[PDB]
Amino acid sequence: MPTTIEREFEELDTQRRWQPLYLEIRNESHDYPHRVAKFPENRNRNRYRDVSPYDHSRVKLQNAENDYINASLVDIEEAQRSYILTQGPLPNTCCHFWLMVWQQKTKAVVMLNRIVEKESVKCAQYWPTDDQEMLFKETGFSVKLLSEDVKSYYTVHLLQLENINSGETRTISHFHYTTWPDFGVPESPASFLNFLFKVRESGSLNPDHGPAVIHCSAGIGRSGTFSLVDTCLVLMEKGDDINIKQVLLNMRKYRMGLIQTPDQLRFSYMAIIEGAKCI
Numbered sequence: 180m181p182t183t184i185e186r187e188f189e190e191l192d193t194q195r196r197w198q199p200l201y202l203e204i205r206n207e208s209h210d211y212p213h214r215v216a217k218f219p220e221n222r223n224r225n226r227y228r229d230v231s232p233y234d235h236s237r238v239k240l241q242n243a244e245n246d247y248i249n250a251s252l253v254d255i256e257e258a259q260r261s262y263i264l265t266q267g268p269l270p271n272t273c274c275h276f277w278l279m280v281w282q283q284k285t286k287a288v289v290m291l292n293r294i295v296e297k298e299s300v301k302c303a304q305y306w307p308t309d310d311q312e313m314l315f316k317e318t319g320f321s322v323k324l325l326s327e328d329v330k331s332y333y334t335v336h337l338l339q340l341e342n343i344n345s346g347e348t349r350t351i352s353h354f355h356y357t358t359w360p361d362f363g364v365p366e367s368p369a370s371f372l373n374f375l376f377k378v379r380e381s382g383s384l385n386p387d388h389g390p391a392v393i394h395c396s397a398g399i400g401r402s403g404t405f406s407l408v409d410t411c412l413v414l415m416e417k418g419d420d421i422n423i424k425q426v427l428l429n430m431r432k433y434r435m436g437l438i439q440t441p442d443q444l445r446f447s448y449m450a451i452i453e454g455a456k457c458i
């Protein structure tokens with residue numbers, strides 16, 4: 180017998196109402212202060228003028244004269260899973276990015292974009308593609324590529340993150356989804372879910388390590404799609420009955436504009452329906 184979400188999907192797909200449902204979510208989303216993002220000193224720390232962390236959820240860089248990074252802590256209590264969503268780092272904010280990864284005790288970075296997409300640069304090359312050490316002098320960190328695992332539609336890089344100021348080093352799993360087009364969707368729910376399950380298997384979404392860092396270019400479209408599916412499946416695994424629109428609206432209180440297109444919203448539902456079948 181069809182589930183509630185399955186029946187919802189069927190009616191939206193047969194009446195072609197994804198586009199109206201998406202606009203309803205934009206209309207029902209709540210705006211919050213995001214004033215720090217607008218300080219003149221933070222102008223060069225934002226990739227997109229219209230995409231800003233909220234002041235009540237932004238990740239703060241500790242012990243820094245300027246604590247600002249365009250990154251949001253998304254903390255759904257019912258899920259007992261918190262994530263950081265951030266933009267693709269700029270050349271001048273790669274140093275802040277790794278500082279945040281260190282301070283947050285992050286174990287996994289999930290990167291959903293390619294560096295160059297639709298004839299523009301979406302993200303700085305913030306990790307070594309070769310054996311040379313990548314140095315971030317502004318915050319005192321160095322990154323080395325230890326190993327790579329190239330799969331058919333994604334690559335996992337094992338990165339060694341060195342805090343030069345404390346001597347300590349940590350291994351970071353860098354999960355690079357290389358087949359997710361900008362403003363588009365993954366090739367299939369199955370391939371998306373296989374990737375999500377591999378991120379989960381690394382234990383890097385558990386409450387024992389720090390929050391995983393998810394990013395694309397703006398940190399809201401593909402990153403929001405990936406987060407909505409992961410959060411809804413986590414809530415479904417706990418046995419609580421969810422409404423996808425309400426979960427997305429709740430997640431939008433932590434970071435504005437999660438899910439950029441009706442097709443992305445549609446894909447979320449599809450992946451959640453397929454994920455529920457595994458559960």
Ligand SMILES: CC1(C)C[C@@H](Nc2cccc(-c3sc(C(=O)O)c(OCC(=O)O)c3Cl)c2)CCN1S(=O)(=O)Cc1cccc(NC(=O)CN2CCC(c3ccc4c(c3)oc(=O)n4[C@@H]3CCC(=O)NC3=O)CC2)c1
Pocket residue numbers: 205206207208209210211227229230301360361362363395396397398399400401402435436437439
């Ligand atoms: C963030 C943005 C800006 C991002 C933009 N996209 C975008 C931009 C830039 C780059 C990119 C890129 S570039 C890129 C790449 O790769 O290149 C990417 O990546 C791609 C990939 O990855 O695929 C991406 Cl992505 C994309 C899309 C849009 N949003 S947005 O939608 O979120 C904005 C937003 C934010 C927050 C919230 C809301 N919505 C509301 O506020 C609705 N309001 C709610 C209250 C309601 C009310 C008001 C008074 C009322 C009332 C109800 O009730 C009452 O009583 N009252 C009063 C009370 C007082 C009184 O006395 N009487 C009354 O009646 C009205 C409606 C909207």
Ligand code: NA
Pocket residue numbers: 367368369370453
């Ligand atoms: Na599938």
